């Protein structure tokens, strides 16, 4: 039970050293099952892989946070059938047919843990976890995930998103019909078409604040940083920010300002977009939301920067060139905008002097942004997207694997009676006279 | 003659065990010398492939079907040369030359089977069969298709598609000079070209339940599934629809409604479209075709769905917006969509309060549709591409198999004589004292 | 001076059955060392590379033209030192260090052979040739043409590049300043405008004159096929029809007809686009002249035709729809056309009822070709680009190999004093007494 | 200290006869590693690798200039820990530790040589060097480079971008509030706003001679050829263009001429724009100015050349053909632009004949333009980037390589105090009782 100053046992120092690479994977996966056979020989009453780091974080749990594929992979698949040594098996084989195995897992610390399961940590790592899109294509978890999936998730999460479907109508209903009288809030009339609106009105503000009380819940239990608040966590943001213009609109709405408009379109706008989130999850339609974020957080920015330095030069340019209607720079850059969108007019006014330095530097912004910026965006899209579609595939499991573990964490019974299969006696040996049963779980393949 | 539970002897398990691999190929290929020579040895009486599983399926049709790519160009090209073993041989060598062999092939159950042949499994295959686009590259297979495309079938398509375009010239034709009077149906005047317009919209009627008739045959003969109905059958399904819409416009001329109007354009618009239909089957043009099929099965539906949410989305938040002419949302999304064509306004009104928050609406929307969305779309695609045009090389072939398969079935002699090759004894050795003939074909290659 | 039932030698039949396969090439390269030592011991009198086939070609003519890069190779390559042997050597080394070798190669049938050299026909092939691209690499063709652009070729190029710059200018200037009178021809004035008017006319038909007597000689020169007239012969083709135009100009123009201007603009049009021919030839510039000629003859007929039919299917079907302006199918046809760049207005016509079934058509319009039709037209461009660049990359040294021997068959002298190298004895050994020499070539590499 | 008959030494020659390949680096290594010590052997009083070329370069600064990475990797990560051997090593090993070593580096001639020092040959390299973006990544260079970043070069830059910002936003707000009385110069008046407005066109005079005065000494310290004029010097020729426009618009304004707005606003244009050089050396925002410059300088040419042919080859066509508004080649020419830009009315006139001929040069016009070329220019930037994106990774450190020696070059304290780290006996061993100190530079990796 030796322990390193970090608060780690050798262990954890096994997963640190190692890299994912054949030869690594080797050496770290040998000498792991050899120093935990020895322990077992040495302290048969102390377990290693139950303790911890500081961080409270298992070897098992490390493993499975820093994106180690080989040790996890290893470790996950463990089995072990040697003289005083089945008893820190991690799965056994049932029916050793040819074509199939009817392995049996210890899900022991991968779906409860009471401090973080490999589950929790994987779906909730910190994204610089190089493999965790691929992590969860180890045997148990792929399984696991799956079954949790059919077994009680889909139908919760699909009626998440007709309950979600059915709020963003309901709101969409109440804003479109808004009153058009002045200086809000509005006397409600003894017609229906207000009791309907003033419904929709609540029910609507009732899910801006659920979704408030979710995302501040999640920022809590989370504890997010600056430097990946955005690269992680964006959906939630995205609920979050949602429900904060509601909750501006509202303020604005007893307020007596007609701005609560402004704040409530945007979340109009932003709760039909968050539909998106509900699409990831699903392998067939949920490349684009992943694509969007990705996009978005990455390449965004940069290509924003320099098409808006590029606009805002020449539409500098141009507002200084011309004089007398345009001659705001605020107009200059819609006009100028408008060339992006195939709609620059490219005489827009005829009210300054020294024609050809006009259309030269127009004809030179839309060789610059029109021709050029924008088919350099498309070229680096299409390497990058060449490049990320195979990480995409498994973005997929990565998301439904945090929408499993949010319903369990919810689960609306006040319990936690999502357990899946064992009732009987597993390992069949143990460094005492007994046996023990840890929550056995089939996997045929 | 042993057999399973479903009715399959071990020829049909030794095919379900294929996977494709090298070692697999050369594993099955050994078991199936071997079981074949004890079947020649032990009951040369009793043929095993001539037994079939439930559903039918010979072990060459279950090969075939299951897309078991290397175990059918083994059987298919099975030379068996060997005493008391010549007699399940499926093709000889006649010229032994350097660079080319006079090989010969047997056709049994390869166009006439009676239950189903190779080119029938192929061909109506479910799509899942992983290997149907280079499974017609199996020597024989690609021979009797080339062979049978030049010998009959080609003229026979080129009519056919001769005809659908005089059919839709006609249709077109009876379509645009349709009368302008009220409340059809419309009577004949005893001017030449009104007797020509109504024999333009009997042939276009006359087609419609030629094409109606076809759709249901098919459908009949098919039997297709929900799960597979669009990714099968794609151009049967358009044909159909089409002469649903034509049928649809009859009886609404003839109920005395202007809406039959409605149908006809469609079923036109439908026609026209329907003729890259014809265009597969050629290399060159072909691509096109296949490639819509493809972006619209797989592409279209979650793209549509993204994009159709923001643009719902930014639309309804719009309408919200403006208050007074576009206060409607059809017309807001109309506006919208405006920009994915390059004829977005960006100021399409001035009823509204907060232009800053209009403005930034319209701006966000055209960023995340106009510049992201299409853009990812253009990256998908240039990727999907980059991965399946490989497939679709192949996929031309495919669907000229089920070319030359439909006109095999049609054939419009009321009569069968419609087999390749064969004109000389061929075998030369049986069990008994006899000799048999298969429908010898030729292979100079 | 062994032949095949044919008549053709040995060496046509070693050529013939060469592959380009490394095992094949040796093979190829060992036979053809065995036959010449043995055609030396045997019948030093007689050569058997100067036979030719029945088709009138060398072997070395023959293994240029069939495109077996690996014999061309080896030929042109082929030193040979050893005792009654080195009188067939191609090329020898006067210079052997280790870094650098001062080859020298003998240009018999490279550039003069009177029937077909070696640059003939690699340059006037059919363009089925699978290595035309990478032939000329080979050391004594790439030095060749190289010598051959730098010493004469390159400013004979670049004057006929500059006098077509001239002539089009010219052209310009003739056409723009026409006269507006009715019914040509036009009196001349004894203004000077009008004489320069003239003269530019005079010189535009004298250059149409040319350039229409250069396409009659190209075409009986080389005898094209309709099935490969456009895959080879592009820009000739187009040099022609420009001529064409030009000449069916000046014929309306002395016939009285104002339709003489519709012919010029084409030509002038053509004209201008056909300096693109100049383009080919510079490694930097010549990229895109290439792949126009490539895309138009390739893509462009399948993209055009699908796109064709979706343009009519729905402008028949929207025609129809509409009643009563745009009623005509031309005028819908050009709406419809419009969406393709970006200037649809999808309200376009208000004379017409359902206005569902009208916009619902018009969307499918615009999502099946400007959403789907043009962007897999991207994707396919993107895919064969990708394949296709390093093909391109050397179809610049082949078009200018088609202008150097353009150019020295040309010549503007009288003569044909266009040799590259070569004053002294070559060989120092013939199987007489006597030494030869057959313009040698020099090559330090 | 032998020499070569152009008078470069043994060593030179080495690194001359490299190219980067495996076996020719042991080669190279081999001998160059076997002379040194032989010249330590024989003359130890004098070094090798101090003694330059003909061209002031040691055999380091030429392995480093001429791109030989290799060799330059080999000589920098040198260590010799042999008798009479060692005193002429590059580094040491401080601490030999399993996973990380403290490796000592000398910087003798990589930051000061006098003559050419290795981060000054790689950074102002002729970019034909083809290991200039990877040979920074040899392990001294690019801890050198990362070392002065955050050590004082990072917060200089920064400084600097923040100042351009606001020479950008004065000269911004200066152009933007100009005068519009006639005839320059203006008089100063006594309002505040005034007053400020002449002291934001004096801070932009002072900029743009700043600029200027930088541009020269660039010019002059480097000495650039017009063949590699852009391909290198890309940025200081923008921003001397700058200057230069500045300039021409101060002469203007006192010159009494309205023209100088003409001037000021491409200033303005130009200013904005070269931004973007700061974008340069962060790695995720610094790709789009590395890949515009890179299209501007490669595909933009020869793309513009085949658009304006085909561009002025139809406008020519259409001014010709139209007769009477629209008739000047100017207009014509704008006309068919629009198309480019998805604004081209495809029906702009109607004073013509021959209406079937307009619109056919139009549409062809717009299907080779719009259609084939724009495409194919995404194509060929897919297809380039696909190519580069790994070159602009490195291009990215190589850009903060120039701006961390310029940094110091300038440095604006009339110091150079900008070492990073030696203050002890560097190598313990010399051929005499010596001992020397010459940067030692820890590497701990
Ligand atoms: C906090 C992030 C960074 C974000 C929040 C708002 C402001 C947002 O602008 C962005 C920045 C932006 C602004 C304008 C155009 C593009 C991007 O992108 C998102 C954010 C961008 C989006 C588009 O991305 C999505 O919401 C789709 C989506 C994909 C995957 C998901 O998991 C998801 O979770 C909800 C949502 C939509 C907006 O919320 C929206 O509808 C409006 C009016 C602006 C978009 O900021
Ligand atoms: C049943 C399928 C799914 C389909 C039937 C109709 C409604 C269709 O809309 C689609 C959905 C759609 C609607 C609007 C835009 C794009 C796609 O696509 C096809 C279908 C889509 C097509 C485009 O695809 C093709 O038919 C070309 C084609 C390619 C390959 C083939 O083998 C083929 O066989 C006929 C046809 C044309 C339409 O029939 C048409 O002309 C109209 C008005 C709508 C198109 O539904
Ligand atoms: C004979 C060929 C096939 C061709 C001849 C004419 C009709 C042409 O239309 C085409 C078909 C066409 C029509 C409309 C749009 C695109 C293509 O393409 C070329 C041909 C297409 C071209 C574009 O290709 C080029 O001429 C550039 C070029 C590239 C490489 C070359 O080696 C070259 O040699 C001259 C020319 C320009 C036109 O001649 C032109 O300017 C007009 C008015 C129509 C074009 O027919
Ligand atoms: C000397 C070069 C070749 C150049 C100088 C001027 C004329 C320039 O036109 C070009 C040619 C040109 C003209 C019109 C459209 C595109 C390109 O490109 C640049 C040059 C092109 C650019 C765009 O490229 C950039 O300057 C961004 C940039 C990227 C990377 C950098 O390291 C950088 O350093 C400042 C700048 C902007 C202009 O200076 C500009 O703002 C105007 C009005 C024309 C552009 O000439």
């Known amino acids: 039970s030796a322990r390193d100053s970090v608060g780690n046992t050798v262990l954890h120092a096994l997963v640190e050293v190692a890299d994912n690479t054949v030869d690594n994977t080797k050496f770290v996966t040998s000498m792991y099952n050899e120093i935990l056979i020895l322990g077992a020989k040495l302290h048969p009453t102390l377990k290693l892989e139950e303790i911890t780091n500081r961080k409270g974080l298992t070897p098992l749990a490390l493993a499975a946070s820093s ?13 072990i059938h040697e003289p005083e040594c089945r008893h820190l098996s991690r799965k056994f084989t ?18 409860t843990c009471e401090k973080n399961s490999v589950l929790e ?5 910190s994204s610089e976890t190089p493999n965790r899109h691929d992590m969860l294509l180890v045997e148990p978890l792929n399984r696991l995930l799956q079954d949790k999936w059919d077994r009680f998730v889909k139908r919760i999460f699909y009626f998440n998103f007709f309950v979600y479907c059915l709020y963003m109508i309901i709101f969409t209903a109440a804003a479109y019909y808004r009153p058009v009288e002045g200086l809000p809030p509005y006397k409600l009339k003894n017609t229906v078409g ?3 609106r003033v419904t929709g009105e609540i029910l609507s503000v009732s899910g801006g604040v659920y979704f408030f009380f979710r995302g501040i819940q999640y920022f809590l239990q989370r504890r997010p940083s600056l430097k990946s608040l955005f690269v992680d966590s964006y959906s939630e943001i995205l609920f979050f920010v949602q429900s904060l213009f509601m909750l501006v609109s509202v303020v ?3 307020s007596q300002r007609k ?6 379109v945007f979340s109009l706008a932003m709760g039909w977009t968050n539909m998106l989130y509900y699409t990831r999850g699903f392998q067939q339609m949920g490349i684009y939301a992943v694509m969007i974020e990705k996009m978005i957080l990455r390449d965004l920015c940069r290509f924003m920067f320099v098409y808006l330095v590029f606009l805002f030069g020449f539409s500098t340019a141009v507002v200084t060139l011309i004089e007398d209607s345009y001659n705001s720079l605020y107009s200059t850059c819609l006009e100028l905008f408008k060339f992006t969108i195939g709609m620059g007019d490219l005489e827009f006014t005829e009210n300054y002097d020294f024609k050809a330095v006009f259309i030269i530097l127009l004809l030179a912004y839309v060789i610059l942004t029109y021709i050029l910026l924008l088919n350099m965006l498309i070229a680096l899209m299409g390497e990058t997207v060449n490049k990320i579609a195979q990480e995409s595939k498994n973005i997929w499991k990565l998301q439904r694997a945090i929408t499993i573990l949010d319903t369990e964490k919810s ?5 936690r009676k999502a357990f899946r299969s064992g009732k009987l006696l597993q390992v069949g040996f143990t460094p ?13 393949e």
């Open 259 to 264: 701005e609560y408009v402004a704040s409530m």
């Open 411 to 415: 689960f609306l019974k006040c319990m």
């Open 94 to 111: 049932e029916w050793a047919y040819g074509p199939v195995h009817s392995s049996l897992y210890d899900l022991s610390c991968i779906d």
């Open 67 to 79: 994106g180690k594929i080989g040790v996890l992979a290893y470790i996950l698949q463990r089995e």
């Open 194 to 196: 207000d009791y309907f």
């Open 121 to 125: 940590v994987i779906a909730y790592s």
């Open 432 to 444: 005492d006279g007994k046996d023990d049963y840890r929550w056995c779980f089939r996997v045929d």
């Open 252 to 254: 604005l709405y007893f």
